[PDB]
Design a protein around this nucleic acid. Structure first.
Ligand SMILES: [Cl-]
Ligand SMILES: [Cl-]
Ligand SMILES: [K+]
Ligand SMILES: [Mg+2]
Ligand SMILES: [Mg+2]
Ligand SMILES: [Mg+2]
Ligand SMILES: [Mg+2]
Ligand SMILES: [Mg+2]
Ligand SMILES: [Mg+2]
Ligand SMILES: [Mg+2]
Ligand SMILES: [Mg+2]
Ligand SMILES: [Mg+2]
Ligand code: NA
Ligand code: NA
Ligand code: NA
Ligand code: NA
Ligand code: NA
Ligand code: NA
Ligand code: NA
Ligand code: NA
Ligand code: NA
Ligand code: NA
Ligand SMILES: [Sr+2]
Ligand SMILES: [Sr+2]
Ligand SMILES: [Sr+2]
Ligand SMILES: [Sr+2]
Ligand SMILES: [Sr+2]
Ligand SMILES: [Sr+2]
Lengths: 81, 46, 194, 119, 65
RNA sequence: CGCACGGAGGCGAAGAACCACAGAUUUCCGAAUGAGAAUCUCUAACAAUUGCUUCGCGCAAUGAGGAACCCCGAGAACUGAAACAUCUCAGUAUCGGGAGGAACAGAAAACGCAACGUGAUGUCGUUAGUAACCGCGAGUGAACGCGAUACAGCCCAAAC
RNA sequence: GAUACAGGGUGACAACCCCGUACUGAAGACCAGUACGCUGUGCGGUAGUGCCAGAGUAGCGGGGGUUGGAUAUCCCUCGCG
């Protein structure tokens, strides 16, 4: 069975969303929906996801931009992992 | 032209096939990419 | 004494005289309106069916078939074929109507194998034949001392390969001695001069 | 329906099958067209039955003319399974026969005569 | 090196199901450091982590569930 | 710790690598079978055709592949005849259907070295370029027998 | 040395450096669910009896095709039987 979250997308623009807009970027499995990416991020990091924006990258993988709520901080999540 | 999901997955792989033989393979075999494609001179599928 | 079966056999010796004459005039009216291949519960000729191998068992099917009459539905020549190779309505085929009938019937039933067939009459535009079919996978036949041969892997699609009784007769394999040098063991092995 | 030259009434048919029902509980009967034909040929048939719903008709066709050239009386039954249950079978019979009735001979004599009156 | 065949058969269908996650997370936490290209890599563990998750999934089918 | 001699790191006496056998896993498209689709998507699926049937897709069958071989069908022209039409090329090419590890054939309504004889079927040798055919031209061409290989002989329909 | 002087390897021409090679022995497949054996069954003979033994068939005629098949090849087709 396939896993949703593969690995985090850690690029310079992935920081411009982490610092400024409180968003965590992951490169997920292409068969996953915005609702499946949402539940998956919560069940692995104990956070609260408000919005998920997807894009099908030119690498065949799916890039998921996950926005957290004010109660959780993106800069603080990227530290432990 | 509007590409579909699969068409994208394919054109994506073809781009990774355009990467050179890494520096270490030369040092391991003790001394050529044959699927060398150009965006102008060559033709892909579809 | 005579069998009740022998009274159907003796009737079919002349399918245009008496009781059978009035029967076939009636039946064909419904048959002309019936399809190409119609599965029928009971055969029209009991003696003939039983003689060919039919039993009143589970997995022993009978089906009537109707094929067009005459010669070949042969066209003309598009590309340059000589005077000799230009006959349109004067030439016929190498498989008799009974063989087409058996094949059409085995394709209608893609799991059942052809046992044998017989004629059930004809009118001006078509010929009717009833084909006995057997289910090779039914245990009712798998343990039958008189029919379990038809369940062998090598008997699969036996009509299409001409291994039918109707098949071997058209292939010119009836005679054991003279005029059967080009027909036995097979036509293809003898270069097709049968 | 082609081998039938006369319609046998329901009232007479009830009287005919009742006689067959007691013929298996006393003497002997013949169940199945093959055994009934040999009965007419061997002469051992007293009264022969024939079903009217036999498809194909060929299995029966001979019975009306055979029973006539052998003097053996015949009678028509509408349904196949009615004659089947009457012979004492679970299935159905196309034609039945009575070989030496037994405690029915006082009715078979009349059934055979009620058919001659009906031609 | 750390997880052998015997040590997996000495577990319960609930200890394996929990060891699965404890390795599946360790993998994602190794794959994340490989996403940044960081130097504190241990090339042998990331390979053996796959082999381990495979072993536990294999034994899981073998033991009923 | 493949090809493939790097770097780094790892595994191995808890007996690894490697190999033999059995098994686990085995994405999607694919006969492709819930429906549609350029390998994707859409709201429970033997789709289709059959058999049996508890008449419910409940139990089953077919589908497609494989170098060639095999069996049943369809069936050319160049070419040869010093042209060409019957004939030849040739039942060759190619096409439609189908089976198996082989296929097909097969236990005489036979043979007819006519006998007081042989005794299922393939195949090999020979019979023989014979008999036979043919604008009697070019060409086409068996068989019975014989010697060998291998051997094997049975089952219904009906009567009762 | 040799029941081993087939072959290859090895920094040059190797039976005795190395793999192998002879001899001997082990496994699988195939032969083959065959042969052999066994189990059940029952082979056979005499006289009496016109009870039974497969139809559009055997065969004939017209048209086609094919064959070495010549009147005497096999086949399809229409009619008759
Ligand atoms: Cl078939
Ligand atoms: Cl002889
Ligand atoms: K020509
Ligand atoms: Mg989008
Ligand atoms: Mg690039
Ligand atoms: Mg052959
Ligand atoms: Mg589909
Ligand atoms: Mg010429
Ligand atoms: Mg010719
Ligand atoms: Mg000339
Ligand atoms: Mg020729
Ligand atoms: Mg001869
Ligand atoms: Na281009
Ligand atoms: Na079939
Ligand atoms: Na990546
Ligand atoms: Na596999
Ligand atoms: Na069903
Ligand atoms: Na010439
Ligand atoms: Na010319
Ligand atoms: Na000529
Ligand atoms: Na021929
Ligand atoms: Na003819
Ligand atoms: Sr990229
Ligand atoms: Sr161009
Ligand atoms: Sr019935
Ligand atoms: Sr098939
Ligand atoms: Sr022999
Ligand atoms: Sr006979």
């Amino acid at each position: 069975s396939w896993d949703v979250i593969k690995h985090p997308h850690v690029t310079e623009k992935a920081m411009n969303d982490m610092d400024f807009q409180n968003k965590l970027q992951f490169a997920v499995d292409d068969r996953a929906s915005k609702g499946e990416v949402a539940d998956a991020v919560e069940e692995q990091y104990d956070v609260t996801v408000e919005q998920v924006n997807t894009q099908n990258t030119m690498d065949g993988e799916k890039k998921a931009v996950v926005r957290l709520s004010e109660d959780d901080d993106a800069q603080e999540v990227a530290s432990r992992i | 032209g509007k590409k579909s999901k699969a068409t994208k997955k394919r054109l994506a792989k073809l781009d990774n096939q355009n990467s050179r033989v890494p520096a270490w393979v030369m040092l391991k075999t003790d001394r050529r990419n044959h699927k060398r494609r150009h965006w102008r001179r060559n033709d892909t599928d579809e | 004494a005579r069998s009740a079966y022998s009274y159907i056999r003796d009737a079919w010796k002349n399918p245009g005289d008496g009781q059978l004459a009035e029967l076939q005039w009636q039946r064909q009216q419904e048959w002309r309106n019936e399809g190409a291949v119609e599965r029928i519960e009971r055969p029209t000729r009991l003696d003939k069916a039983r003689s060919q191998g039919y039993k009143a068992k589970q997995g022993v099917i009978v089906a009537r078939v109707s094929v067009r009459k005459g010669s070949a539905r042969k066209r003309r020549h598009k590309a340059g074929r000589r005077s000799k190779r230009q006959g349109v309505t004067r030439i016929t085929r190498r498989k008799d109507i009974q063989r087409v009938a058996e094949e059409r019937a085995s394709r209608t039933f893609p799991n059942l194998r052809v046992l044998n067939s017989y004629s059930v009459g004809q009118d001006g535009r078509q010929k009717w034949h009833e084909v006995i079919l057997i289910d090779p996978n039914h245990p009712a036949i798998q343990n039958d001392d008189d029919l379990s041969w038809i369940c062998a892997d090598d008997q699969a699609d036996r009509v299409f390969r001409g291994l039918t009784g109707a098949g071997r007769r058209n292939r010119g394999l009836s005679g054991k001695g003279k005029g059967s040098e080009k027909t036995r063991p097979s036509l293809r092995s003898n270069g097709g001069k049968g | 329906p082609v081998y039938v030259d006369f319609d046998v009434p329901a009232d007479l048919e009830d009287d005919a099958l009742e006689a067959l029902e007691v013929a298996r509980d006393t003497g002997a009967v013949k169940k199945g067209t093959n055994e009934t034909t040999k009965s007419i040929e061997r002469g051992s048939a007293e009264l022969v039955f024939v079903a009217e719903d036999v498809q194909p008709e060929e299995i029966v066709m001979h019975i009306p003319e055979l029973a006539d050239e052998k003097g053996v009386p015949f009678i028509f039954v509408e349904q196949q399974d009615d004659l089947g249950h009457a012979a004492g079978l679970e299935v159905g019979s196309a034609a039945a026969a009575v070989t030496d009735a037994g405690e029915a001979d006082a009715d078979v004599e009349d059934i055979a005569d009620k058919v001659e009156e009906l031609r | 090196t750390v997880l052998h065949v015997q040590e997996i058969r000495d577990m319960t269908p609930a200890e394996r199901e929990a060891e699965l996650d404890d390795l599946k997370t360790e993998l994602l936490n190794a794959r994340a450091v490989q996403a940044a290209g960081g130097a504190p890599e241990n090339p042998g563990r990331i390979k053996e982590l796959r082999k381990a998750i495979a072993r536990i999934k294999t034994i899981q089918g073998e033991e009923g569930d």
